[PDB]
Amino acid sequence: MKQGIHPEYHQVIFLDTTTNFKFLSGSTKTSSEMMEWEDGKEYPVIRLDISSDSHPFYT
Template sequence: MRPGIHPVSRPVVFRDRVSGFHLLTRSTVDTRQTVEREDGITYPVVDVEISSASHPFYTGNTRVVDTAGRVQRFERRYGRTAPARH
């Protein structure tokens, strides 16, 4: 490999904000936040919105999406379109 062109890979903790799940892996992401793990070592940390610990597909929890309410809110916001002519 040519020196000086590759990003530095280092251990990084990815933390799920919802469930508190932590995953220690190697990454090239740059972050200034740190967290101390159970082993007493301080690692850079990246907060993520969702992971396998909180994703509905992996946990089996389903979410109800109110599509009718979304359509009505869209129509209130932007108005109804004219009916199509054939």
């Protein structure tokens, strides 16, 4: 955590429309688009996610 070259970080609720994977990370501690508490109050509009939903290992 190179404090001195460390901007913000957090466990972002990057919820999807498929599988609702709001257990993610980023720099945008987002608004309460999904004003929820099962996941953080972050934007759930990030729907394109295949590694759990439609991936080469499992479509």
